[model samples]
Target: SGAIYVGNYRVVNRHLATHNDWANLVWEDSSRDLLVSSTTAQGCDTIARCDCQTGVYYCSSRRKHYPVSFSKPSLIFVEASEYYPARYQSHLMLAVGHSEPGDCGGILRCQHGVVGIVSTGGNGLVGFADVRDLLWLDE
Candidate 1:
């Protein structure tokens, strides 16, 4: 068939010249250009885009780096092997709540989509509020 993403592996190999002959499956070549690198042997339906780039991915941050608690902000990202551009960056501004054992701590909100602790199951928003609760933006 065609090439597919299987837990970080490709189904169709680059062995066939006919597969990559056309721009069927786009892969990153040594030149850093996104190109078709698969063969159109069979079951190849569409052209796949490769996650390759030419320039260095620069990560820009607004605030300087500082030590942050693990539960302060939850982050979502792609697999380490994949190439990605830093769409956004965050930094710890300040701790808003008192450091307590069982009470809630205030965390600075950088973004709403960031992962944070809301419950024992570990599903919640990361933000700053009263030391007794978490501040999640509804928007």
Candidate 2:
């Protein structure tokens, strides 16, 4: 499975899920275990379990959406900078006309459900970590 890679830790654990027929990325955990452990760089109580669920491409959100094309200044209309386009393998997503700052690792949501993880963005384009095979659950 993929991982929610953060500076502090990596969030793991997953299961299949949905919301109002749209795919969802849910974390069913509490702040106590999620945050309270870090009191000025101190150890935590017992074990810590963060939220998670089953979604393709694990460690991130998963949904389907499309938008108007961004002006491909590069003359070419298609390129694969990250993971190969696969349904059950971890890959990167680039929302052609979407937007984000250089900052990375945020959730990308659509009216339907969670979409992808924000990887990086600039010039009216955004990047994401695909969640189709996030958990890497393939044969």
Candidate 3:
């Protein structure tokens, strides 16, 4: 397994269109058949839960990334100063854990069905889970 970074960013049209994908990074909760997704600029914020097997996404919260000016001018070309990357992708794994935190208290095991994102920390339970979980799972 490789390291998985959950963020709202992706590589689409470069230079003129630096970032335009809202659903870049995503996680799935299979057992619960739930999904928690968020988007960056150009699109509204989204929190969704979907059917594990059916792949049906349900919107919970909707908002915008709130673009702002950043220093990464060269690497990033965008229409707006706050332009970053947006993402909406999800993966199915039996377990979702992290390593940096050195704690595995919140590991999601969905063998029969997998749940998308399990919160160990950060942003809240909606965002990514334990830092250690995402890292250790990489190893």
Candidate 4:
């Protein structure tokens, strides 16, 4: 349960001989002073990371990727019998109302135990006018 640092060495797992006898006694064989074998743009060799002291392999990018839209509807809370089961014995919430600054619009606040409106074979109660729509009402 020891010796583990795979990127810059310290491996030990080859069938373990007491953890490769302490990884061959502190194996300090630093891959020829730390890696350098580049050439990749699909042209093949690879093992980067050996800072430039006349050896170079560089690639770095921060960001600029875009594509969006999925009918935007998010606000979760499901499981009051998951989809109206046990016919509402109070404890049913499914909220999703969005549309803040364009294109993020979705709305549906079905529930029980917040400001009411939970009827159907389980009796009745109805009243709703935003009390944060009953914050997960009776969570």
Best by lDDT: 2
Segments of candidate 1 deviating more than 4 angstroms: 1-66, 69-99, 111-137
* Models ranked on lDDT: 2, 3, 1, 4
Residue-level lDDT tens digits of model 1 in 16-110:
21443445544423111112333333332222122111111111121222233333322232122223342221211123222321222111222
Q: Please say which candidate is ahead in lDDT: 1 or 4.
A: 1
Order the candidates by TM-score, highest first — what do you get? 2, 3, 1, 4
- Best of the candidates, TM-score: 2
Task: Score every model by TM-score.
Answer: 0.14, 0.30, 0.17, 0.11
Clash statistics: count for each candidate: 6, 16, 29, 0
lDDT of 3 at 120: 19
Error of 3 at 9 (Å): 15
Candidate 4: where is the Cα deviation over 4 Å? Answer: 1-62, 77-139
Which run of 10 residues does model 2 get worst, by summed lDDT?
30-39
Residue-by-residue lDDT tens digits, candidate 3, 29-100: 322223333345332222222222222111123211111111110111112222223322122222211222
Better of 2 and 4 by lDDT: 2
- Each prediction's Cα RMSD? 19.3, 15.5, 18.2, 25.6
The CA lDDT of each predicted structure is 0.22, 0.31, 0.23, 0.20
Clashing pairs in 1: 19-38, 19-39, 19-40, 20-38, 20-39, 74-115
